[PDB]
Amino acid sequence: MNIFEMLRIDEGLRLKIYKDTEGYYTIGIGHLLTKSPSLNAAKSELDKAIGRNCNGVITKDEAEKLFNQDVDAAVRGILRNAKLKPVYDSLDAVRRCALINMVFQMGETGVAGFTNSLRMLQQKRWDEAAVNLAKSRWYNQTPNRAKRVITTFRTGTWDAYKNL
């Protein structure tokens, strides 16, 4: 497993515009288009993103391309965020993927927000952070995925993804 394989599992692949867990227009491997309720806004965003007339459909190549940009963006966002950098730099290679996973899913600001959980990760207090992390909207809304990610932070292994 690597970060690509992990996000691939959490997000699945769709070549047609679809609605998020939160009902937002997305495509590919979890590539949010817009939070606006109009399919029209979404298609406009899709065309902009791809640089062609898509009419709500992309190719797999194009999906993977958005995915390459989004993983790259998540890493760089981390490394630039004053709050996320130190945590990332303190973690081992498996757990770094867990952090990325959250930033990909809820954004930089989303994650910078888990003050207590990040303090716990930095301190390598793994059980404690897993409990703290479960005390969130994230976990109540997407439990299956959150368990997989929390499990990764707790164990530093890929066992949560092996099953899948």
Curated annotation (Swiss-Prot):
Substitution effect: residue 26 to E:
Complete loss of activity at neutral pH; covalently bound substrate
| Consequence the record notes for mutating residue 117 to F | 10-fold decrease in enzymatic activity
List where in the cell it is found.
Answer: Host cytoplasm
Q: Which UniProt keywords apply?
A: Antimicrobial, Bacteriolytic enzyme, Cytolysis, Glycosidase, Host cell lysis by virus, Host cytoplasm, Hydrolase, Viral release from host cell
Molecular function GO terms recorded:
lysozyme activity
Hydrolase in keyword set: yes
Q: What reactions does this protein catalyze? A: Hydrolysis of (1->4)-beta-linkages between N-acetylmuramic acid and N-acetyl-D-glucosamine residues in a peptidoglycan and between N-acetyl-D-glucosamine residues in chitodextrins
Relate the outcome reported for changing residue 26 to H: Facilitates transglycosylation more effectively than hydrolysis; covalently bound substrate
Q: At which positions is substrate bound? A: 32, 104, 117, 132
Q: Name one Pfam family in it.
A: Phage_lysozyme
Which PANTHER family does the UniProt entry name for this protein?
A: T4-TYPE LYSOZYME 1-RELATED (PTHR37406:SF1)
Q: Which HAMAP family match?
A: ENDOLYSIN_T4 (MF_04110)
- In its UniProt entry, what is this protein called? Endolysin
Task: Give the species.
Answer: Enterobacteria phage T4
Q: What is the lineage of its organism?
A: Viruses, Duplodnaviria, Heunggongvirae, Uroviricota, Caudoviricetes
